[PDB]
Symmetry: D2
Subunit: 448 residues, 4 copies
């Protein structure tokens, strides 16, 4: 793809260049490839990404961590296995395909899958501006005296220089993933760190890997379990504690019938249901992604706890402990020592104390950051509508009398409520990328 000068009106501007945006780029490439599409002037496109280079959840690239989905659900295969952007073609290009085959696994290390996506991302370097944090989307009128919006201005702050840049586009995609969700009862402290900053910020706080630190982990999902388990290897002499409201770590449901809810074709079926039925369906399949741990990891942690029991039958003396059915009621963190004092009580409706050097908080993400960006375009929604309403094709509903048919805003990754549990995942990216290219560039590609 060829670059577009900053000053030109773009056909599409995409906010964020994580997997969701990358899947769109790939799908656009493939749609424009005569070897893949018998139909195939390039669209004027640009991706803005706040990170300085492509990275996928680098704060959680835990040593040994594995993908939780088959490599077949990569960024292209489910749309077109002939694509140059498949995982298998990536491996072939790296001279590693036969070697991977001998592993007999569908689940690559997260490190390898990141490198796959990095390899994909590098092929779009001409159309991605890195180090650009988007701060706002503003409506624009090519005829300022009219009452019709027909473009948007996207403003971004250079992360290095702090300078503001503006780019104009007919169409916008917001694909910015999630922001760290923190419990509202915990105070702000450098020793209290969200899971997303685990690999990034914890080593800077706890510099000496040999020291007998006390480290707590709050949560019971995949991130909590991965951190809990990794801390035992990273800090071999540390005393770790897993704090959870639930009675137990629970396994992720990847059984084949249940798992079909992640099929690309099931988005149609989910989207068509009423608000009530969609709400009920999300709760019925909560065990497939939310606050759950991959079985193999649960078993590994359980085995480690058993080995501690072999060495010492007194659980209170174990180096590493799990404290179930607990909630944090108070955090003392103004004292003269390195350690905070965490007060615990029963998570049951109507206990002990921990002293820790750090508290890792694995409480998931919020996916409402698009709201702050779209603040100035809110008035273009149908009268009295106080929430963004994405259509099946991910384009938000706007007042047809206020916005031209050629102008629009699409949301990606934040649409679980309307599109299902696969929305925030990698599960349907390849197919969704294809659908997005058709939605956004359909008229243009139809001409050829």
């Amino acid at each position: 793809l060829r670059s577009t000068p900053q000053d030109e009106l773009h056909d599409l501007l995409c906010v964020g260049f994580g997997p969701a945006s990358l899947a769109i780029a790939i799908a656009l490439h493939d749609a424009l490839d005569p070897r893949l599409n018998k139909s195939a002037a390039q669209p004027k496109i640009c991706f803005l990404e706040r990170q300085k280079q492509f990275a996928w959840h680098s704060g959680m690239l835990v040593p040994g961590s594995k993908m939780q989905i088959s490599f077949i659900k990569d960024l292209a295969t489910l749309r077109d296995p002939r694509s140059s952007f498949t995982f298998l073609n990536y491996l072939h290009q790296k001279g590693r395909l036969i070697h991977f085959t001998n592993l007999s696994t569908f689940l690559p290390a997260r490190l390898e899958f990141e490198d796959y996506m990095r390899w994909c991302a590098q092929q779009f370097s001409d159309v991605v501006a890195y180090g650009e944090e988007v701060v706002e989307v503003i409506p624009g009128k090519s005829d300022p005296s009219s009452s019709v919006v027909d473009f948007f201005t996207v403003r971004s702050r250079n992360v290095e220089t702090g300078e503001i840049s503006a780019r104009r586009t007919r169409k916008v995609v917001i694909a910015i993933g999630g922001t760290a969700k923190m419990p509202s009862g915990l105070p702000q402290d450098p020793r209290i760190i969200h899971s997303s900053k685990y690999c990034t910020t914890l080593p800077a706080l706890l510099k000496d890997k040999s020291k007998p630190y006390n480290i707590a982990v709050l949560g019971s999902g995949q991130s909590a379990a991965e951190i809990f388990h990794d801390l035992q290897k990273r800090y071999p002499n540390s005393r770790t504690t897993l704090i959870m409201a639930d009675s137990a770590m629970r396994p992720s449901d990847d059984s084949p019938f249940v798992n079909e809810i992640f099929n690309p074709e099931r988005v149609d079926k989910f989207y068509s249901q009423s608000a009530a039925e969609r709400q009920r369906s999300l709760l019925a399949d909560k065990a497939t992604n939310y606050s759950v741990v991959r079985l193999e990891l649960i078993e590994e942690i359980y085995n480690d706890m058993y080995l501690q029991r072999v060495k010492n039958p007194d659980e209170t003396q174990w180096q590493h402990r799990i404290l179930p059915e607990r909630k944090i009621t108070r955090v003392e963190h103004h004292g003269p020592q390195s350690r905070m004092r965490i007060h615990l009580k029963s998570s049951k409706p109507e206990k002990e104390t921990l002293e820790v050097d750090a508290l890792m908080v694995a409480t998931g993400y919020n996916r409402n950051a698009h709201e702050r960006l779209l603040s100035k375009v809110q008035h273009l929604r149908p009268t009295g509508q106080d929430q963004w309403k994405p259509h099946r094709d991910y384009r938000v509903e706007m007042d047809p009398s206020k916005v031209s048919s050629e102008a629009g805003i699409w949301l990606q990754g934040c649409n679980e409520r309307t599109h299902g549990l696969s929305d925030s995942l990698l599960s349907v990216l390849a197919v969704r990328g294809g659908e997005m290219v058709q939605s956004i560039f359909g008229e243009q590609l139809e001409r050829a």
Copy 2:
């Protein structure tokens, strides 16, 4: 154990001789064994069982069916691994121990585990009366002019002769398992058969194993899946249909932390919680036993469905089908043909038709049959109490002013509400058997 004449006052009478009663017999044997118990006149005991010989859920002894619990949770091992009644000692006695070891499985065929329990049961033939269906428990007073009950009369109907027999005892155990639960909307028909009568009554209805029968299965739990899968082998030319209200077969949770709720020592912890907390706990762990299927079986059924897809991409033509999110709204069964007409609708709140030769109904069991038996002893409960309240030791609460301290009634297998999800299972039988012997015969065994 030596037999007691019918006319003598017994120390204990046990109603039922399934696994729960058998575990008590075994525990009593072990308590009276000087090789196992350094402490050790035999108690006057009798077991009444309606079946003509020992059998364990013989209507569901499906070819190839496996246990869903480790053989270590047999009828003795968790109480005393030295017991002659362990699974491993059974195998050693049969000359099969080394051969079983080479299987490297914790999960024996149900056929083998039944034979194990049969081998155990045969050693108590002197104290078990088979072919005796208990019909009522009646209070008795050794001083009829007093207001104090100090014994019970247990009346049973001989299944062959229909004759009524009475036996008197100080203490009663009711361990009678469950009765077939049928949906209240289905009419009575020989072609509508509960899962518990699958192996017993279906072959008599559908005699020719080669015929192209249409057979429906209602349900989504283990029994439904086992029947659905077995029907495809038993009737190779049949057209089978699995009808379920849920969207999918869901896997049983046997992950190690969750599974600890089945530990014998956790009964104390569960029992001590309030009514509210126990109710919440039962629902939190519903995925461990209720309306769930062993993963290996789900995968096998899924693979079979995939193979049908390979042969024919049109699901409506498949020999064997699953119809999820469906409820039966009407059954036509008065027509001139062999087949009933089953009308289906969506299980969603505010469809097709099946013609079938048989409907197998796998909707679980009720565990309230003790109520009918205890009807005449109800007046001995504390005033205004309209439900049986078992203590931790399984003895029901009675008015101390109306019932002697030497007289009592115990319940087994029907106490999930107070004792947890393991209550109706094999999970805690060995330990519970030990506890029951202490509760019932404690004073007697304390003397020696």
Copy 3:
């Protein structure tokens, strides 16, 4: 690919259209595809196949049988994952890709993998002549008065009409797989049938699937185990016996380091070794393909034998039996009854009798059938050479003074001795197909 008239001089004629020839066709297609090869007059090519339509070992398409290699080692992927002929693209074309992904298996049913190859094969119908059994390859001289051979005539017998057809070509490939190997001590009898004719000819002999037949299986490899296991399902009332010289069924070695001997790049390394070192290497890795059984199948058969032990401790009474360390010394088959009398002795160097309705013989294949076809071209080998010597590129050595550089004969599938254990398998077909196209059509493709 476009067809060539029978009378024209061909660039290549391939004898056989099994996987090995199909891999060449696919590789040629891909080499001529401008979307895959930036380089790309079509070569005049024809494939002759004795079967009336594409089929892959249909006599052993046992119900439930699985592939013994990852689907990644299909007919294209290891050469180019972008190819339209990959397994994943086949699944995508059939609308089954997402469904296969949910199986989480690398091992498709043999039935599905056959259909994949059939789907591939159908795209070459213009260049394949079915029902043509090649009977001889004859040298030809465009100048008959010269001493230089520069073409070959390939003669084939129409399987339906018996008519002989001749086609001329510069280059020949022989890719005809193997022929049934039978022990030299067994007499010819309709009741004695090679494993390759199991699904084809056994049902015709033993027509009634309900009858209590006695059926023996000779052998201890994959085919023997698959037949032994299948016979128990196909003939539910039959008495089956597995006769083997070895003490036990042994598992195939698919462990990752060992398995690297099947890597495409290892052919170079194997080929370069001396005759002595190649001989030693073949024997060192015998456990990877020869007289071995997939572990999962061994365990399944073992479990079945254990279940028989549960029902009856007396092995002599078992419906299905394995007789290890046995050899057949005599077969009585002239008697007045339906059954043959098989005499057995110990396989040890210096026993019982079986009466059977059929003996299935699973003793592998011979790969020397090219010899009979190449009989009249033998004189073109270097003087005094009495065996065909394939180069690394599979072209047999010929006397440069007797044969033109544009004429040649290639062998495929029969080269284990020089090229390694992967030669007769699917393991390296995709890469080898690519190498073959370069060897055969190199000069032609170099021009473009």
Copy 4:
């Protein structure tokens, strides 16, 4: 068991108190237990052990190492599952039985299985003399003027004081396991260490766990693989190299039919075969114990090597490497540096250099140490017999005219040649212990 004074004539003296001797002690206890044996003066018995307390291969108690046999093949279960010395009863005594059950594994950590055997061993402390290294067995005659031997004197050296003690016994068992086998081409050096001294002596040589040591491992069996893998965790910055003569690590054969060669009842069958047939049988099943690695460990090492490939495609740069088909031809170890210089060549019949801080040598064991101990009793063998010939019951053949029927010597653990591959393992210890008690104490126990 009660102790016997040193000066008294013993009924049995056992040299060594590893698993094999411990199994005899346990079997004797059980034979004398009235709860287990209806038959049951205690025999005068003593065990001499060179280690200061019970330990099982403590130089190879690698962190995370697992048993390679089912816990059912413990020191008692296969003989009598009712025994107090079973693994399950040990777990019950430690309050760990339910917790172990939830692991759903047949394979305990080596650490746990050692503790089990330690728990067993401690119950025989009265009859075991620790810190006693046996140096010789001498014939004795109660009538010195006669030509009949009727006792043996066993002399041992106190490991602490160096003092020699003599004990007299009618019967001797030698159960001393194996001694480190070193290749004859390697020179003696503190930096060259056998696998048996891995956990004991390597940390003393390489004290700083953070240092970038170069460490080589010679061998391709279980010990080599365990050391190779452990070194990567123990010395995180080390450069490790696995040197092996074979082309690849090969998996242990634990498939169920093959594995039956380890059945206790198969000893009879093996022993009865001729010398030739026994030799052939040992080689046929070499893949079950000799120079083989547990599959799970091979896969784990392979995955680690794959991860190195992901990070760097150049194998020569990998931190950890495997060098197959290599033999050591020279070791330079007189140089002024900390590192030895290891010269390698191809292991093929008719290369590089490594500089290493330590060479771990995992080349198995010799089992001929009984020869040195029995030197002075050799003359009691039948004339012209130059090797010890154990009967089926493990008693060595002696000249009936030179040795009384009440005197004898038994061998344990060194009898693979006559008794099969299970001889040196834990596989048949429980049953063999039972057989040994009958052989040794038969007459005595028959009286009661």
